[PDB]
Amino acid sequence: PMFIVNTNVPRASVPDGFLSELTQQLAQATGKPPQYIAVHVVPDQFMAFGGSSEPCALCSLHSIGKIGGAQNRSYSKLLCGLLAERLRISPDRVYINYYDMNAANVGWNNSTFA
Amino acid sequence: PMFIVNTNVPRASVPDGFLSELTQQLAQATGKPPQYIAVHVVPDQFMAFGGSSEPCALCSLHSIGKIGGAQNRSYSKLLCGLLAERLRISPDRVYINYYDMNAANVGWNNSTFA
Amino acid sequence: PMFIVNTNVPRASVPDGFLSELTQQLAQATGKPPQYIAVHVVPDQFMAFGGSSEPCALCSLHSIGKIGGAQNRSYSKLLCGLLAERLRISPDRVYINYYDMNAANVGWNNSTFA
């Protein structure tokens, strides 16, 4: 799995530990080993949500399987929570796009996961 | 809806009010209220289009529905027009990927849209 | 086609000629004129792979067709090889997401490719 956060919250406001926390939290949430979890946080963005420049986030979660209606509800509660507590972003100013990737469509280590 | 623009045009060349203009125009074109509209502009990129580093843009529009042949043609004219007028980018150096998202795959406010 | 590379490798460790090399090798690999190829390299990112901040890359390849099981294995061999030779990133710390885009869903030059 891979989790990307783009946000207008400044770099300095991203707490020590946040990548490692995202990694352990997603490894737990997805049931995948942490060695397979990639995390990417992109602060200081020029972005707006609802027309306002108050803190906000645009995020993506890509996984081969482990993506569905109930699972994504449980991801968004987990992830919004972490962004609220760590980054001080309101859950109603967060978007998370979920992608169920086909193994053949994910390359790694000179090949794909097919 | 969410609209992202990545461009090699420098930050200083993005005119004031550019995020609010995208938000208003995308509310109108999509039928969604400006409240649900997210916009993200990423200048100063290291990027090439056709092997050339003249001004260019790679862009994404995600929406739950409101994506289709005619609508996308209409979005592209809207949006190339704004990048031409506001950022001095030629329309033939713009790519815009459209994504019709399933409601169960968009997270927001601790839940999903399904 | 469009190829995006997000990496924590610093800007100064990206060798001169990289975008042109990527454009040339993707033209060859996808069978498409280099005029249609767009390439985007984002260095200096705050990311982790498998909970390590050693060099890593998260990438995407979008193409209208020329996407599939075998083709994507071949892409991954070519693309990992380049990120290992040029950026000194281990192929097992690279992900590349492949997207077969519908022509209706790729905007360009005020319209779409449909």
Coordinates of all heavy atoms in Angstrom, one line a residue, chain C residues 36-108:
Chain C
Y36 N 4.5 13.2 -27.7 CA 3.4 12.9 -26.9 C 3.8 12.5 -25.5 O 3.0 12.2 -24.7 CB 2.6 11.7 -27.4 CG 1.7 12.2 -28.6 CD1 2.3 12.4 -29.9 CD2 0.4 12.5 -28.5 CE1 1.6 12.8 -31.0 CE2 -0.4 12.9 -29.6 CZ 0.3 13.1 -30.8 OH -0.5 13.5 -31.9
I37 N 5.2 12.4 -25.2 CA 5.6 11.9 -23.9 C 5.8 13.1 -22.9 O 6.5 14.1 -23.2 CB 6.8 11.0 -24.0 CG1 6.7 9.8 -24.9 CG2 7.3 10.7 -22.5 CD1 5.9 8.7 -24.3
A38 N 5.2 13.0 -21.7 CA 5.4 14.0 -20.7 C 6.1 13.4 -19.4 O 5.8 12.2 -19.1 CB 4.0 14.7 -20.3
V39 N 7.0 14.1 -18.8 CA 7.8 13.4 -17.7 C 7.9 14.5 -16.6 O 8.0 15.7 -16.8 CB 9.2 13.0 -18.3 CG1 10.1 12.5 -17.2 CG2 9.1 11.9 -19.3
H40 N 7.9 14.0 -15.4 CA 7.8 14.9 -14.2 C 8.6 14.3 -13.1 O 8.2 13.2 -12.7 CB 6.4 15.1 -13.9 CG 6.1 16.0 -12.7 ND1 4.9 16.1 -12.1 CD2 6.9 16.9 -12.0 CE1 5.0 17.0 -11.1 NE2 6.2 17.5 -11.1
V41 N 9.7 15.0 -12.6 CA 10.5 14.4 -11.6 C 10.4 15.3 -10.3 O 10.7 16.6 -10.4 CB 12.0 14.3 -12.0 CG1 12.8 13.8 -10.8 CG2 12.1 13.2 -13.1
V42 N 10.0 14.8 -9.2 CA 9.8 15.6 -8.0 C 10.8 15.1 -6.9 O 10.5 14.2 -6.2 CB 8.4 15.5 -7.4 CG1 8.1 16.6 -6.5 CG2 7.2 15.6 -8.5
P43 N 12.0 15.8 -6.8 CA 13.0 15.3 -5.8 C 12.7 15.9 -4.4 O 11.8 16.7 -4.2 CB 14.3 15.8 -6.3 CG 14.0 17.1 -7.1 CD 12.5 17.0 -7.5
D44 N 13.6 15.6 -3.4 CA 13.6 16.2 -2.0 C 12.4 15.9 -1.2 O 12.0 16.7 -0.4 CB 13.8 17.8 -2.1 CG 15.2 18.1 -2.6 OD1 16.2 17.8 -2.0 OD2 15.2 18.6 -3.7
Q45 N 11.6 14.8 -1.5 CA 10.4 14.6 -0.8 C 10.6 14.0 0.6 O 11.6 13.3 0.8 CB 9.5 13.6 -1.6 CG 9.1 14.2 -3.0 CD 8.3 15.5 -2.8 OE1 7.1 15.5 -2.5 NE2 8.9 16.7 -3.1
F46 N 9.6 14.2 1.4 CA 9.5 13.6 2.8 C 8.7 12.3 2.6 O 7.5 12.3 2.5 CB 8.7 14.6 3.7 CG 8.8 14.3 5.1 CD1 9.9 13.8 5.8 CD2 7.6 14.7 5.9 CE1 9.9 13.5 7.2 CE2 7.6 14.4 7.3 CZ 8.7 13.8 7.9
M47 N 9.4 11.2 2.4 CA 8.8 9.9 2.3 C 9.5 8.8 2.9 O 10.8 8.9 3.2 CB 8.5 9.6 0.8 CG 9.7 9.8 -0.1 SD 9.4 9.2 -1.8 CE 8.2 7.9 -1.5
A48 N 8.8 7.7 3.2 CA 9.4 6.5 3.7 C 8.8 5.3 2.9 O 7.7 5.3 2.4 CB 9.2 6.3 5.2
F49 N 9.7 4.3 2.8 CA 9.2 3.0 2.2 C 9.6 1.9 3.1 O 10.8 1.7 3.5 CB 9.9 2.9 0.8 CG 9.4 1.7 0.0 CD1 8.8 1.9 -1.3 CD2 9.7 0.4 0.3 CE1 8.5 0.8 -2.1 CE2 9.3 -0.7 -0.4 CZ 8.7 -0.5 -1.6
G50 N 8.6 1.2 3.5 CA 8.9 0.0 4.5 C 9.5 0.5 5.8 O 10.2 -0.2 6.4
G51 N 9.2 1.8 6.1 CA 9.5 2.5 7.4 C 10.9 2.9 7.5 O 11.4 3.1 8.5
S52 N 11.6 2.9 6.3 CA 13.0 3.4 6.1 C 13.0 4.7 5.3 O 12.3 4.7 4.2 CB 13.9 2.3 5.5 OG 15.0 2.9 4.8
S53 N 13.8 5.7 5.6 CA 13.9 6.9 4.9 C 15.1 6.8 3.9 O 15.6 7.9 3.4 CB 13.8 8.1 5.7 OG 15.0 8.3 6.5
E54 N 15.7 5.6 3.7 CA 16.7 5.4 2.6 C 16.2 5.8 1.2 O 14.9 5.9 1.2 CB 17.2 4.0 2.6 CG 18.1 3.6 3.8 CD 19.3 4.6 3.9 OE1 20.2 4.5 3.0 OE2 19.2 5.3 4.9
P55 N 17.0 5.9 0.2 CA 16.4 6.4 -1.1 C 15.3 5.5 -1.6 O 15.3 4.3 -1.6 CB 17.6 6.4 -2.0 CG 18.7 6.9 -1.1 CD 18.5 5.9 0.0
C56 N 14.1 6.2 -2.0 CA 13.0 5.4 -2.5 C 12.3 6.2 -3.6 O 12.7 7.4 -3.7 CB 12.1 5.0 -1.4 SG 11.4 6.4 -0.4
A57 N 11.4 5.6 -4.3 CA 10.6 6.4 -5.4 C 9.2 5.9 -5.4 O 8.9 4.7 -5.4 CB 11.3 6.3 -6.7
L58 N 8.2 6.8 -5.5 CA 6.8 6.4 -5.8 C 6.5 7.1 -7.2 O 6.7 8.3 -7.3 CB 5.9 7.0 -4.7 CG 6.1 6.4 -3.3 CD1 5.2 7.0 -2.3 CD2 6.1 4.8 -3.4
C59 N 6.1 6.3 -8.1 CA 5.9 6.7 -9.5 C 4.6 6.3 -10.1 O 3.9 5.3 -9.6 CB 7.0 6.0 -10.4 SG 8.7 6.1 -9.8
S60 N 4.3 6.9 -11.2 CA 3.1 6.6 -12.0 C 3.3 6.7 -13.5 O 4.1 7.5 -13.9 CB 2.0 7.7 -11.7 OG 1.7 7.6 -10.3
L61 N 2.8 5.8 -14.3 CA 2.9 5.8 -15.8 C 1.4 5.7 -16.3 O 0.7 4.7 -16.0 CB 3.7 4.6 -16.3 CG 3.8 4.7 -17.9 CD1 4.6 6.0 -18.4 CD2 4.5 3.4 -18.5
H62 N 1.0 6.8 -16.9 CA -0.4 6.9 -17.5 C -0.2 6.8 -19.0 O 0.6 7.5 -19.6 CB -1.0 8.2 -17.2 CG -1.3 8.4 -15.7 ND1 -0.4 8.8 -14.8 CD2 -2.5 8.3 -15.0 CE1 -1.0 8.9 -13.6 NE2 -2.3 8.6 -13.8
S63 N -1.0 5.9 -19.6 CA -1.0 5.8 -21.2 C -2.3 5.4 -21.7 O -3.0 4.7 -21.0 CB 0.1 4.7 -21.5 OG 0.2 4.6 -23.0
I64 N -2.6 6.0 -22.9 CA -3.8 5.5 -23.5 C -3.5 4.2 -24.2 O -2.8 4.2 -25.2 CB -4.4 6.5 -24.5 CG1 -4.8 7.8 -23.7 CG2 -5.5 5.9 -25.4 CD1 -5.1 8.9 -24.8
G65 N -3.9 3.1 -23.6 CA -3.4 1.7 -24.0 C -1.9 1.5 -23.8 O -1.3 2.3 -23.1
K66 N -1.4 0.4 -24.3 CA 0.0 -0.1 -24.2 C 0.2 -0.3 -22.6 O 1.4 -0.2 -22.2 CB 1.0 0.8 -24.8 CG 0.7 1.2 -26.3 CD 0.8 0.0 -27.2 CE 2.3 -0.5 -27.4 NZ 2.6 -1.1 -28.7
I67 N -0.8 -0.8 -22.0 CA -0.7 -1.1 -20.5 C -1.2 -2.6 -20.4 O -2.3 -2.9 -20.9 CB -1.6 -0.2 -19.7 CG1 -1.1 1.2 -19.6 CG2 -1.6 -0.6 -18.2 CD1 0.4 1.3 -19.0
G68 N -0.5 -3.4 -19.7 CA -0.9 -4.8 -19.5 C 0.1 -5.6 -18.8 O 1.2 -5.1 -18.6
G69 N -0.2 -6.8 -18.5 CA 0.7 -7.7 -17.7 C 2.1 -7.7 -18.1 O 3.0 -7.4 -17.3
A70 N 2.3 -8.2 -19.3 CA 3.7 -8.2 -19.8 C 4.4 -6.9 -20.1 O 5.5 -6.6 -19.8 CB 3.8 -9.1 -21.1
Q71 N 3.6 -5.9 -20.6 CA 4.1 -4.6 -21.0 C 4.6 -3.9 -19.7 O 5.7 -3.3 -19.6 CB 3.1 -3.8 -21.7 CG 2.9 -4.2 -23.2 CD 1.8 -3.6 -23.8 OE1 1.9 -2.8 -24.7 NE2 0.6 -4.0 -23.3
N72 N 3.8 -4.1 -18.6 CA 4.1 -3.4 -17.4 C 5.3 -4.1 -16.7 O 6.1 -3.3 -16.1 CB 2.9 -3.6 -16.4 CG 1.7 -2.8 -16.9 OD1 1.7 -2.1 -17.9 ND2 0.6 -2.9 -16.2
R73 N 5.5 -5.4 -16.7 CA 6.8 -6.0 -16.3 C 8.0 -5.4 -17.1 O 9.0 -5.0 -16.6 CB 6.7 -7.6 -16.4 CG 5.8 -8.2 -15.4 CD 5.9 -9.7 -15.3 NE 5.3 -10.4 -16.4 CZ 4.0 -10.7 -16.4 NH1 3.2 -10.2 -15.5 NH2 3.5 -11.3 -17.5
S74 N 7.9 -5.2 -18.4 CA 8.9 -4.6 -19.2 C 9.2 -3.2 -18.8 O 10.4 -2.8 -18.7 CB 8.5 -4.7 -20.7 OG 9.6 -4.2 -21.4
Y75 N 8.1 -2.4 -18.6 CA 8.3 -1.0 -18.1 C 9.0 -0.9 -16.7 O 9.9 0.0 -16.5 CB 6.9 -0.3 -18.0 CG 6.1 0.0 -19.3 CD1 4.8 -0.1 -19.3 CD2 6.8 0.2 -20.5 CE1 4.0 0.0 -20.4 CE2 6.0 0.4 -21.6 CZ 4.7 0.3 -21.6 OH 4.0 0.4 -22.8
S76 N 8.7 -1.9 -15.8 CA 9.2 -1.8 -14.5 C 10.7 -2.2 -14.6 O 11.5 -1.6 -13.9 CB 8.6 -2.8 -13.6 OG 7.2 -2.6 -13.4
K77 N 11.1 -3.1 -15.5 CA 12.5 -3.4 -15.6 C 13.3 -2.2 -16.2 O 14.3 -1.8 -15.6 CB 12.7 -4.7 -16.4 CG 14.1 -5.3 -16.4 CD 14.5 -6.1 -17.6 CE 16.0 -6.6 -17.5 NZ 16.3 -7.4 -18.8
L78 N 12.7 -1.5 -17.2 CA 13.4 -0.4 -17.8 C 13.4 0.8 -16.7 O 14.5 1.4 -16.5 CB 12.4 0.1 -18.9 CG 12.9 1.4 -19.3 CD1 14.1 1.1 -20.2 CD2 11.7 2.0 -20.1
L79 N 12.3 1.1 -16.0 CA 12.2 2.2 -15.1 C 13.0 2.1 -13.8 O 13.6 3.0 -13.4 CB 10.7 2.6 -14.9 CG 10.1 3.1 -16.1 CD1 8.6 3.2 -15.8 CD2 10.7 4.4 -16.6
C80 N 12.9 0.9 -13.2 CA 13.8 0.6 -12.1 C 15.2 0.7 -12.4 O 16.0 1.2 -11.6 CB 13.4 -0.8 -11.5 SG 11.8 -0.9 -10.6
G81 N 15.6 0.2 -13.6 CA 17.0 0.3 -14.1 C 17.5 1.7 -14.2 O 18.6 2.0 -13.7
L82 N 16.6 2.6 -14.8 CA 17.0 3.9 -14.8 C 17.1 4.6 -13.4 O 18.0 5.4 -13.2 CB 16.1 4.7 -15.7 CG 16.2 4.3 -17.2 CD1 15.0 4.9 -18.1 CD2 17.5 4.6 -17.9
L83 N 16.1 4.4 -12.5 CA 16.2 5.0 -11.2 C 17.4 4.4 -10.5 O 18.1 5.1 -9.7 CB 14.9 4.7 -10.4 CG 13.7 5.4 -11.0 CD1 12.5 4.8 -10.4 CD2 13.8 6.9 -10.8
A84 N 17.7 3.1 -10.7 CA 19.0 2.6 -10.0 C 20.3 3.2 -10.5 O 21.1 3.7 -9.8 CB 19.0 1.1 -10.0
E85 N 20.5 3.2 -11.8 CA 21.7 3.8 -12.5 C 21.8 5.3 -12.2 O 22.9 5.7 -11.9 CB 21.6 3.5 -14.0 CG 22.9 3.1 -14.6 CD 22.7 3.3 -16.2 OE1 21.7 3.8 -16.7 OE2 23.6 2.8 -16.9
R86 N 20.7 6.1 -12.4 CA 20.8 7.5 -12.3 C 20.7 8.0 -10.9 O 21.5 8.9 -10.5 CB 19.9 8.2 -13.3 CG 20.1 7.7 -14.7 CD 21.4 8.2 -15.2 NE 21.5 7.8 -16.6 CZ 22.6 7.5 -17.3 NH1 23.8 7.6 -16.6 NH2 22.5 7.2 -18.5
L87 N 19.8 7.5 -10.1 CA 19.4 8.1 -8.8 C 19.9 7.2 -7.7 O 19.8 7.6 -6.5 CB 17.9 8.3 -8.7 CG 17.3 9.3 -9.7 CD1 15.8 9.6 -9.5 CD2 18.0 10.6 -9.7
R88 N 20.5 6.1 -8.0 CA 21.0 5.1 -7.0 C 20.0 4.6 -6.1 O 20.2 4.6 -4.9 CB 22.2 5.8 -6.2 CG 23.2 6.4 -7.2 CD 24.2 5.4 -7.8 NE 24.9 4.7 -6.7 CZ 25.8 5.2 -5.8 NH1 26.1 6.5 -6.0 NH2 26.3 4.5 -4.9
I89 N 18.8 4.4 -6.6 CA 17.6 3.9 -5.7 C 17.5 2.4 -6.0 O 17.5 2.0 -7.2 CB 16.3 4.6 -6.1 CG1 16.4 6.1 -6.0 CG2 15.2 3.9 -5.3 CD1 15.3 6.9 -6.7
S90 N 17.4 1.6 -4.9 CA 17.3 0.1 -5.1 C 16.0 -0.2 -5.7 O 15.0 0.3 -5.2 CB 17.4 -0.6 -3.8 OG 18.7 -0.3 -3.2
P91 N 15.9 -1.1 -6.7 CA 14.6 -1.4 -7.3 C 13.5 -1.9 -6.4 O 12.3 -1.8 -6.6 CB 14.9 -2.5 -8.4 CG 16.4 -2.4 -8.6 CD 17.0 -1.7 -7.4
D92 N 14.0 -2.5 -5.3 CA 13.0 -3.0 -4.3 C 12.5 -1.9 -3.3 O 11.8 -2.2 -2.4 CB 13.5 -4.2 -3.6 CG 14.7 -3.9 -2.7 OD1 15.2 -2.8 -2.6 OD2 15.1 -4.9 -2.0
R93 N 12.9 -0.6 -3.6 CA 12.3 0.6 -2.9 C 11.6 1.5 -3.9 O 11.6 2.7 -3.7 CB 13.4 1.3 -2.0 CG 14.0 0.4 -1.0 CD 15.1 1.1 -0.1 NE 14.6 2.3 0.5 CZ 13.7 2.4 1.5 NH1 13.2 1.3 2.1 NH2 13.2 3.6 1.9
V94 N 11.1 0.9 -5.0 CA 10.4 1.7 -6.0 C 9.0 1.1 -6.1 O 8.9 -0.1 -6.2 CB 11.1 1.6 -7.4 CG1 10.4 2.2 -8.5 CG2 12.5 2.3 -7.2
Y95 N 8.0 1.9 -6.1 CA 6.6 1.5 -6.6 C 6.3 2.2 -7.9 O 6.6 3.5 -8.0 CB 5.5 1.7 -5.6 CG 5.4 0.7 -4.5 CD1 5.0 1.1 -3.3 CD2 5.8 -0.6 -4.7 CE1 4.8 0.2 -2.2 CE2 5.8 -1.6 -3.6 CZ 5.2 -1.2 -2.4 OH 5.1 -2.0 -1.4
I96 N 5.6 1.6 -8.9 CA 5.2 2.4 -10.1 C 3.8 1.9 -10.3 O 3.5 0.7 -10.6 CB 6.0 1.9 -11.3 CG1 7.5 2.1 -11.1 CG2 5.5 2.7 -12.6 CD1 8.3 1.3 -12.1
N97 N 2.9 2.8 -10.2 CA 1.5 2.6 -10.5 C 1.2 2.7 -12.0 O 1.6 3.8 -12.6 CB 0.5 3.4 -9.7 CG 0.5 2.9 -8.2 OD1 0.6 1.8 -7.9 ND2 0.3 3.8 -7.3
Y98 N 0.6 1.7 -12.7 CA 0.2 1.8 -14.1 C -1.2 2.1 -14.3 O -2.1 1.4 -13.6 CB 0.7 0.5 -14.9 CG 2.2 0.3 -14.8 CD1 2.7 -0.5 -13.8 CD2 3.0 1.0 -15.7 CE1 4.1 -0.8 -13.8 CE2 4.4 0.8 -15.7 CZ 4.9 -0.2 -14.7 OH 6.3 -0.2 -14.7
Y99 N -1.6 3.0 -15.2 CA -2.9 3.4 -15.4 C -3.1 3.4 -17.0 O -2.5 4.1 -17.7 CB -3.2 4.9 -14.9 CG -3.0 5.0 -13.4 CD1 -1.7 5.4 -12.9 CD2 -4.0 4.7 -12.5 CE1 -1.5 5.5 -11.5 CE2 -3.8 4.8 -11.2 CZ -2.6 5.2 -10.7 OH -2.4 5.3 -9.3
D100 N -4.0 2.5 -17.4 CA -4.6 2.5 -18.8 C -5.7 3.5 -18.9 O -6.8 3.3 -18.4 CB -5.0 1.0 -19.2 CG -5.5 0.9 -20.5 OD1 -5.4 1.9 -21.3 OD2 -5.8 -0.2 -20.9
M101 N -5.5 4.6 -19.5 CA -6.5 5.7 -19.6 C -7.3 5.5 -20.8 O -6.8 5.2 -21.8 CB -5.8 7.1 -19.6 CG -4.9 7.5 -18.4 SD -5.8 7.5 -16.8 CE -7.0 8.9 -17.2
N102 N -8.6 5.8 -20.6 CA -9.6 5.8 -21.8 C -9.3 7.2 -22.4 O -9.1 8.2 -21.8 CB -11.1 5.8 -21.3 CG -11.5 4.5 -20.7 OD1 -10.9 3.5 -20.9 ND2 -12.6 4.5 -19.9
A103 N -9.3 7.2 -23.8 CA -9.1 8.4 -24.6 C -10.0 9.5 -24.2 O -9.5 10.6 -24.2 CB -9.1 8.0 -26.1
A104 N -11.3 9.2 -23.9 CA -12.3 10.2 -23.5 C -11.9 10.9 -22.2 O -12.5 11.8 -21.8 CB -13.6 9.5 -23.3
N105 N -10.9 10.3 -21.5 CA -10.6 10.8 -20.1 C -9.3 11.4 -20.0 O -8.7 11.6 -18.9 CB -10.6 9.6 -19.1 CG -12.1 9.0 -18.8 OD1 -12.3 7.8 -18.5 ND2 -13.1 9.8 -19.1
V106 N -8.7 11.8 -21.1 CA -7.4 12.5 -21.3 C -7.7 13.7 -22.1 O -8.0 13.7 -23.3 CB -6.3 11.6 -21.9 CG1 -4.9 12.5 -21.9 CG2 -6.1 10.3 -21.1
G107 N -7.6 14.9 -21.3 CA -7.8 16.2 -22.0 C -6.4 16.7 -22.5 O -5.4 16.4 -21.9
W108 N -6.5 17.4 -23.5 CA -5.3 18.0 -24.3 C -5.9 19.0 -25.3 O -6.9 18.7 -25.9 CB -4.5 16.9 -24.9 CG -3.4 17.5 -25.8 CD1 -2.2 18.0 -25.5 CD2 -3.4 17.4 -27.3 NE1 -1.5 18.4 -26.6 CE2 -2.2 18.1 -27.7 CE3 -4.4 17.1 -28.2 CZ2 -1.9 18.2 -29.1 CZ3 -4.0 17.2 -29.6 CH2 -2.8 17.8 -30.0

